[PDB]
Specification:
The PDB classes it as oxidoreductase. This is part of a larger assembly, with chains A (about 50 residues), B (about 120 residues), C (about 475 residues), D (about 350 residues), E (about 200 residues) and F (about 100 residues). With about 475 residues, chain C is an all-alpha fold. Chain C is built from 19 helices and five strands. Chain D is mainly α. Classes of the chains: A mainly alpha (about 50), B mainly alpha (about 120), C mainly alpha (about 475), D mainly alpha (about 350), E mainly alpha (about 200), F mainly alpha (about 100). Bound molecules: cardiolipin (CDL), the ligand CCCCCCCCCCCCCCCCCC(=O)OC[C@H](COP(=O)(O)OC[C@H](N)C(=O)O)OC(=O)CCCCCCCCCCCCCCCCC, 1,2-Distearoyl-sn-glycerophosphoethanolamine (4 copies), 1,2-diacyl-glycerol-3-SN-phosphate (5 copies) and calcium ion.
């Protein structure tokens, strides 16, 4: 019954909308490539070179 | 009639206008884009492998019965539009006659539901 | 709607109320476990409604701005329809259960068909005629096709639906022309405008379209070809229904239309009705000779008998209508008796329908063959049977109207038709080598054979006021 | 100029100019709808969305549109060629065509007809034929399956769509769209709008609008994870562009209807600010924002489960509401709160 | 102009109707049929019967789509290669000619004006006018129409209803009642322990 | 100038076309159902044409009820066709022919 009542009032959809809006106004982790780059550790295996 | 000229002629005019806009958009690529068809390009898509057959075979429609009942319910609701528009002027018979009409509808709807006609074949 | 309007249509509301309540009771309290109970409550309901229609004191009138006419004519027709419908259901109950055909919705569909028939015979308006006819027709298509595993039931429904819809379209097209000419759908308005000096081709076209549309429902030639296939394909209980109640309602409707809307142009429509009657009498008689299936034979029997009934209407008189009413009453009784026997026919526990199965049946079950003998001579119109007096009445109306040529043609076709009824008697009593057909009849089905068979002889002594009742009913219509 | 604007020509030009105003608004809004739709999903998805093509990505839709104009039209070998090109044409044309009766302000309507509600229903439902015919005419299995789903979708949301709004007609006493707005005028700003007396039908209309627009959770005729692109799998370049244009124009029409039927159209939510077309556009874009947010937060139904909602939930509820509203309006319960007719 | 509007709708309907019955492609017949109904709706508007013009489109847009469903459900196996036509065209022409001759001399009865049950009022909109007579004067027909529709409901279910008993089905309410707390639980499995 | 005769002529053409569709069709029963719908559409054209030219609403009232029966007829027609297709595997008109004589 409690679960039936909450589904009638669309509570699961309301919670999703609220969660979506919390993400909506939150900072984005997106990098602004090519101006901003991902992190590389010293161990990173990239292009080969002869020293 | 004035009502026809003032209100319905614009619908006919805009029907042509919206049609012209849609047609011009199709012809834009037909005239500008490069056309280079070949047998592989124009073959049917089925995710990279050739289709087993085309789409001109019989196919069971598991909601066929609900679609038949859709036709019936469409006419039932149609009788409500003149009633709703005339609601202010309805007589006592005109009002309760609709209630009887809707009660007969609900008996039919309760019969469909109880029979199981709303579950797919 | 006034309280006087509602009182007038009360028998129809009672039937409609029962059909709705029965639908919910069947749906919610057992479905097919109530099928047998709903069938027998429907039989009681038909008889109760007939008592409301036919008993007590009645004063003729109209309701709903003349759209519904409650007169002696409509009351005569309703009673016969309801009692014939009750008889068909009662006699078929055991058969349908044994054959696993009794859905709890079958009684309800029949009840709504009868409801449509009740509005047909009381129509005082083109729209009332249409809505009553269509409620009946739609219910008849369904029961024609209700044996789902039978390809022949499916084809019977398909042929009936397509051709019934075509006839309905022709009826509507003529009804639209009549409305355009007269400016109204009410028959009292229509009759006043359709008169000798004002019959344009348009309004005469309307009458032809309406007449042809209706003449389909009584299987008048050449609007008959549906009948043999539909009679054969549909379940025998449903065939028995088609043969009795719809034909009575449809015949009364035609009389209602031609007298209450076209009553001042009798000369114009009488000739058309006569031509339909002639073609139906001869084709039904001639085509019946070539039948080996008993159900398909009854269709041609039905077509020929409707031709004779149309002879009474072609007279265009109160006596013609009176005798058409009596003819339809006697015809319905005869078909109830015959289809009671046809339902019983079976070999090795499966139903059988071929005529050769009747060979030497009189030496298997003497009383049933004797009943069948009286019915076949009654259908052939041979004295002393009540079937003869039915033909005598319509022939009397024809001669009375200066249409002896029609009466002469009618009796000649009767002679040709008498052959295939005589042949059934020949098979039963001195036919060829027997294949073991047995007649399985319960008490109710048994009485559905004997009582109509007795009525064919007892009715020869006294009609018990039915002939006098038909005369009063005809007067209210014709005036 | 008076000698001109009274003539047949000045009358003929007036209609054409009015028609261009509608096309300009609907097509111009289409630039920002596709952009705004994508920006809203991205914001909910911890990302940016289009932000490089023009300032903050604001020219993205121009780039997309132009790309299709110079993209090759591929015609499937086995396709029914006339019906193949008729389907996209109907999809875009009819959605735009429905706006001919949409009012945006007092007197800002191209066609002020008495049956405006029914005309909307006629045009929007006929638009579904583009999806049904587009899928079938391609003559391949995935578009064929989507074609049947489109017919199923119509049967699901239309059976109760009429009933959902019958209450608003009862309260108004008219099917004229302008009349419905005027019935929501009063001394209490937004408290006179129909969303309040018909609160249940706002939910039912919004959900039905999502299904009518093939939008999540009812994006079943495309359904990428099941059908590759559904009815559009075999369409390219501008014919494909027309299907997307029609999808957004149909969505924009539902945003107009939501605002007209339930939120007073161009009326001001507060008494002290003036009424005008600005309120209509603000409400239309709020409801578009709701369309975009839903796409970002819901999964997809099975199309048999959509049919359950239409027939076993919406149909009994809308039917019950119509009867309830009729009683409340007939007896003027709460002093004609549901009886706005004169 | 009214003349141009009539012939646009008139030619469209008559041509569309012909294409419905003589074309060999059943899906093309479906699309011709909807064009005929739209064209007839255009004619109805010209005459001022706007409600039945709009009602006709609303009803038959859905109904024609259902017809498409049955065409593809029962599609013939010879789609790629999909009579007494000469005599039939002769009887059709004869019937059409007879109707044209009857309509040449059409004139209503001189009493037709006085017999109108529901005279039209110029100041009343079409939908309101119909609503004033449909549910009061024609209340008996209104109720019979409901029963006509009920018979169709019963018949369709009686004739055709059946359900596959070999496919997997879910009860939606039982799906929505599934409690995650009850359906999943954590177990303390000791090292070396199997089932 | 468009008068009543113009609409009656259109109605007559559609009516004869719909009747023609029934008795010339061989390959599909659904197309017969379409022809029946054409025939009933022609009837409504007559009723609407007579209604508006007489200044009477009865013909428009009649049209609403013709649509009601048309809807019921289509529902039952398709249902009967479904049971035939299940029993025969075809819906060709020429295959509805087992009963004859
Ligand atoms: C005038 C008012 C008319 C409005 C109502 C229309 C008539 C509907 C009645 C038919 C229902 C029926 O046959 O099932 C009876 C249902 C039993 O049905 P069943 O055949 O055993 O199967 C159960 C369903 O399959 C199990 O349900 P499901 O899995 O199909 O999911 C649907 C779910 C969803 O439930 C709903 O949403 C239905 C709610 C009903 C709305 C009607 C009133 C609205 C009032 C207006 C208020 C405004 C809205 C806010 O509804 C139910 O759980 C069924 C409950 C029955 C509805 C009774 C109303 O219970 C009864 O026996 C009651 C009969 C009375
Ligand atoms: C009628 C109403 C209905 C809705 C209108 C229709 C829809 C129009 C389509 C356009 C949709 C636009 C979506 C915008 C989403 C932007 C992101 C968002 O929501 O805020 C999240 C971001 C925060 O993250 P950050 O940028 O990493 O912040 C770091 C920095 N230190 C900072 O605080 O920033 O913070 C920011 O982004 C802050 C700047 C916000 C930009 C404000 C303008 C948005 C356009 C509004 C148009 C109105 C019409
Ligand atoms: C008189 C009423 C009929 C009573 C018949 C008695 C037969 C007993 C029987 O077994 O059936 C009664 C049946 C209800 O079935 P029951 O057996 O109670 O169900 C068990 C639950 N599974 O009951 C029925 O089948 C009832 C059928 C409906 C009767 C409708 C009554 C109203 C008549 C219409 C009036 C309209 C006025 C407006
Ligand atoms: C409980 C009661 C059951 C129903 C009985 C209804 C009685 C109706 C009746 O008698 O109606 C009278 C009516 C004529 O009325 P009127 O002219 O007014 O008579 C003078 C009155 N002062 O008379 C008529 O309308 C005449 C009706 C004649 C009916 C003939 C039978 C029709 C066909 C059915 C045959 C049934 C065969 C038997 C089946 C056996 C079982 C299957
Ligand atoms: C061996 C030889 C056999 C030859 C055939 C025998 C003749 C059969 C004639 C049957 C009797 C018909 C008759 O008498 O005429 C009927 C009718 C007279 O009645 P009427 O004057 O209209 O009175 C109206 C009452 N208010 O109408 C008349 O006035 C005459 C109408 C004659 C109808 C055609 C008769 C054709 C004869 C039969 C041909 C063979 C079959
Ligand atoms: C924001 C943009 C403005 C929002 C409002 C959009 C309204 C456009 C539809 C115009 C409706 C119309 O038909 O206007 C007619 C009206 C008066 O016409 P009249 O002949 O008196 O009456 C007609 C009789 N049936 O005519 C008028 O009174 C003038 C109509 C307004 C013309 C200005 C709108 C032009 C279109 C702007 C395109 C750019 C907007 C899109 C940008 C993105 C928006 C998010
Ligand atoms: C800040 C950036 C603004 C950019 C442009 C915004 C466009 C707004 C669209 C129109 C207004 C829609 C209002 C929707 C209703 C708000 C819902 C809400 O806040 O839920 C509580 C919701 C609770 O979510 P929870 O944290 O998961 O409980 O609030 C928040 O988390 C903060 C979101 C506030 C949003 C207000 C600003 C609009 C963006
Ligand atoms: C639909 C088929 C099923 C019908 C079953 C239910 C029948 C109708 C409901 C039961 C109560 C009706 C009592 C009527 C009272 C009366 O005559 O006075 C009216 C009464 C005023 O009459 P007065 O007493 O003369 O002033 O009006 C009212 O206030 C009530 C109006 C109700 C209108 C309902 C119309 C439907 C009935 C017709 C059924 C059609 C035939 C079916 C075949
Ligand atoms: C109102 C109706 C408005 C138009 C509705 C669209 C249906 C009519 C167009 C059917 C065209 C069939 C052409 C098939 C073909 O092989 O030609 C392809 C045709 C030939 O290639 P092209 O020489 O590059 O045009 O390709 C097209 O671009 C056809 C574009 C159709 C334009 C009308 C839409
Ligand atoms: C379904 C949900 C129903 C909610 C119940 C709302 C009760 C409103 C009763 C209004 C009574 C009245 O004076 O009606 C005539 C009144 C006439 O006002 P006028 O049109 O400005 O003359 O009704 C209206 O059309 C406006 C009423 C606005 C007041 C609503 C107050 C609601 C506050 C709670 C909001 C949350
Ligand atoms: C010919 C044998 C002897 C009979 C002599 C009478 C000649 C008339 C024969 C009628 C048969 C031909 C069929 C046409 C019926 C004409 C009706 C007529 O003349 O009425 C007067 C009538 C004059 O109009 P009024 O003055 O407004 O009555 O004629 C017309 O102008 C009617 C126009 C018919 C519209 C045709 C629409 C076509 C739709 C597209 C079809 C593809
Ligand atoms: Ca009379």
């Amino acid at each position: 019954f409690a679960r039936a009542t909450k589904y009638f009032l669309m509570w699961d959809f309301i919670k999703g909308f609220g969660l979506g809006m919390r993400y909506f106004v939150s900072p984005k982790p997106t990098l602004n490539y090519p101006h901003e780059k991902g992190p590389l550790s010293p161990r990173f295996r990239g292009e080969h070179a002869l020293r | 009639m004035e009502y026809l000229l003032q209100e319905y002629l614009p619908i006919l005019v805009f029907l042509g206008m919206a049609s012209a806009l849609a047609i011009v958009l199709i012809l834009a690529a037909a005239v500008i884009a490069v056309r280079n068809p070949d047998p592989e390009k124009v073959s049917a898509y089925e995710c990279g492998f050739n289709a087993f057959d085309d789409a001109r075979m019989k196919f069971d429609v598991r909601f066929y019965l609900v679609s038949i009942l859709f036709i019936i319910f469409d006419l039932e609701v149609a009788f409500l539009f003149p009633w709703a528009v005339s609601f202010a002027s309805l007589s006592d018979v005109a009002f309760w006659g609709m209630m009887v009409f809707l009660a007969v509808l609900t008996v039919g709807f309760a019969y469909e539901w109880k029979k199981g006609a709303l579950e797919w074949a | 709607m006034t309280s006087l309007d509602f009182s007038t249509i009360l028998p129809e509301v009672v039937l409609a109320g029962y059909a709705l309540a029965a639908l919910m009771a069947g749906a919610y309290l057992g479905k097919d476990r109530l099928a047998r109970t709903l069938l027998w409550v429907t039989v009681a309901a038909f008889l109760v409604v007939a008592a409301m229609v036919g008993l007590g004191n009645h004063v003729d009138g109209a309701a709903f701005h003349g759209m519904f006419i409650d007169d002696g004519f409509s009351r005569f027709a309703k009673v016969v329809t309801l009692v014939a419908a009750a008889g068909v259901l009662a006699m078929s109950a055991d058969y349908m259960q044994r054959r696993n055909m009794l859905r709890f919705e079958f009684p309800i569909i029949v009840a709504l068909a009868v409801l449509g028939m009740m509005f047909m015979v009381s129509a005082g308006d083109l729209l009332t005629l249409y809505m009553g006819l269509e409620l009946q027709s739609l219910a008849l298509y369904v029961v024609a096709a209700m044996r789902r595993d039978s390809v022949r039931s499916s084809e019977a429904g398909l042929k009936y639906f397509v051709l019934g819809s075509l006839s309905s379209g022709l009826l509507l097209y003529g009804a639209s022309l009549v409305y355009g000419f007269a400016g109204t759908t009410g028959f009292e308005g229509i009759i006043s405008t359709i008169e000798a000096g004002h019959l344009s081709l348009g309004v005469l076209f309307g009458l032809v379209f309406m007449l042809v549309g209706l003449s389909f429902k009584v299987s008048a030639v050449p609007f008959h070809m549906w009948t043999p296939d539909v009679y054969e394909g549909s379940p025998t209980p449903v065939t028995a229904f088609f043969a009795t109640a719809p034909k009575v309602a449809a015949m009364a409707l035609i009389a209602r239309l031609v007298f209450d809307a076209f009553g001042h142009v009798i000369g114009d429509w009488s000739q058309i009705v006569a031509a339909l009657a002639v073609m139906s009498m001869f084709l039904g008689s001639i085509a019946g000779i070539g039948q080996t299936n008993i159900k398909r034979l009854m269709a041609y029997s039905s077509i020929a008998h409707m031709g004779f009934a149309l002879v009474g209407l072609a007279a265009g008189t109160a006596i013609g209508v009176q005798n058409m009413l009596l003819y339809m009453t006697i015809y319905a009784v005869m078909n109830i008796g015959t289809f009671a026997f046809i339902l019983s026919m079976e070999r090795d526990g499966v139903p059988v329908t071929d005529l050769a199965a009747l060979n030497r049946f009189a030496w298997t079950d003497p009383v049933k063959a004797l009943a069948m003998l009286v019915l076949m001579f009654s259908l052939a119109g041979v004295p002393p049977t009540l079937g003869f007096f039915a033909k005598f009445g319509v022939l009397t109306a024809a001669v009375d109207a200066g249409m002896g040529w029609l009466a002469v043609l009618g009796v000649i076709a009767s002679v040709i038709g008498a052959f295939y009824y005589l042949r059934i008697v020949y098979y039963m009593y001195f036919g060829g080598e027997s294949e073991g057909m047995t007649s399985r009849m319960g008490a109710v089905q048994y009485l559905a054979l004997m009582v109509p068979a007795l009525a064919m002889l007892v009715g020869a002594i006294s009609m018990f006021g039915v002939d006098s009742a038909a005369g009063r009913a005809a007067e209210t219509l014709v005036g | 100029m008076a000698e001109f604007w009274a003539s047949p020509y000045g009358f003929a030009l007036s209609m054409l100019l009015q028609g261009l105003a509608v096309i300009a608004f609907v097509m111009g809004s289409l630039i920002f709808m596709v952009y705004g739709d994508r920006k809203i999903w991205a914001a909910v998805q911890m990302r940016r969305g289009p932000n490089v093509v023009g300032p903050w990505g604001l020219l993205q839709t121009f780039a997309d549109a132009l790309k299709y104009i110079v993209k090759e039209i591929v015609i499937p070998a086995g396709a029914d060629k006339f019906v193949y090109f008729l389907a996209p044409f109907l999809s875009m044309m009819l959605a735009l065509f429905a706006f001919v009766v949409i009012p945006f302000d007092e007197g800002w309507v191209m066609a002020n007809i008495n049956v405006g509600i029914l005309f909307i229903f006629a045009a929007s439902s006929l638009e579904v034929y583009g999806v049904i015919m587009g899928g079938w005419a391609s003559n391949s299995k995935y578009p064929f399956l989507a074609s049947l789903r489109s017919a199923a979708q119509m049967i699901s949301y239309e059976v109760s769509l009429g009933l959902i709004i019958i209450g608003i007609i009862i309260s108004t006493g008219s099917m004229n769209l302008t009349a419905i707005v005027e019935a929501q005028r009063g001394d209490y700003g937004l408290l006179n709008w129909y969303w309040l007396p018909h609160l249940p039908m706002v939910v039912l209309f919004f959900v039905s609008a999502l299904a009518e627009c093939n939008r999540p959770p009812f994006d079943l005729v495309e359904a990428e994870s099941e059908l590759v692109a559904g009815f559009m799998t075999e369409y390219s370049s501008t014919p494909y562009l027309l299907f997307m244009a029609g999808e957004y124009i149909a969505m924009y029409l539902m945003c107009a209807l939501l605002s007209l039927l339930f939120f007073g159209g161009w009326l001001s939510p507060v008494p002290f600010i003036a009424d005008g077309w600005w309120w209509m556009v603000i409400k239309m874009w709020f409801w578009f924002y709701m369309f975009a947010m839903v796409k970002a937060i819901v999964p997809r139904y099975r199309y048999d489960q959509l049919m359950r909602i239409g027939w076993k939930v919406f149909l009994p509820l809308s039917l019950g509401w119509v009867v309830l509203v009729a009683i409340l309006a007939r007896y003027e319960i709460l002093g004609g709160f549901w009886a706005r007719f004169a | 102009m009214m003349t141009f509007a009539f012939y646009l709708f008139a030619i469209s309907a008559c041509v569309a109707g012909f294409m419905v019955v003589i074309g060999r492609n059943p899906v093309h017949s479906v699309l011709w049929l909807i064009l005929a109904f739209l064209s007839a709706a255009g004619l109805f508007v010209l005459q001022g019967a706007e409600f039945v013009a709009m009602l006709l489109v609303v009803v038959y847009v859905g109904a024609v789509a259902v017809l498409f469903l049955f065409v593809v459900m029962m599609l013939d196996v010879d789609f790629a290669e999909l009579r007494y036509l000469p005599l039939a065209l002769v009887i059709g022409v004869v019937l059409l000619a007879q109707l044209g001759i009857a309509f040449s001399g059409w004139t209503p009865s001189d009493q037709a004006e006085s017999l109108r049950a529901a005279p039209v009022d110029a100041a009343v909109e079409n939908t309101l006018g119909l609503g004033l007579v449909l549910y009061d004067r024609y209340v008996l027909m209104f109720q019979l129409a409901g029963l006509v529709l009920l018979v169709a409901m019963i018949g369709a279910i009686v004739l055709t209803m059946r359900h596959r008993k070999d496919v997997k089905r879910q009860n939606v309410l039982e799906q929505m009642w599934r409690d995650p707390a009850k359906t999943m639980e954590l177990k303390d499995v000791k090292p070396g322990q199997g089932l | 100038m468009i008068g009543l005769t113009h609409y009656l002529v259109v109605g007559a053409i559609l009516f004869v076309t719909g009747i023609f569709g029934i008795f010339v069709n061989r390959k599909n029963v659904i197309v017969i159902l379409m022809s029946i719908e054409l025939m009933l559409l022609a009837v409504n054209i007559n009723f609407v044409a007579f209604s508006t030219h007489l200044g009477d609403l009865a013909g428009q009232v009649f049209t609403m009820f013709v649509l009601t029966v048309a809807a019921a007829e289509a529902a039952i027609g398709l249902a009967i066709l479904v049971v035939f297709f299940r029993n025969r595997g075809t819906i060709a008109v020429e295959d509805v022919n087992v009963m004859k004589g």
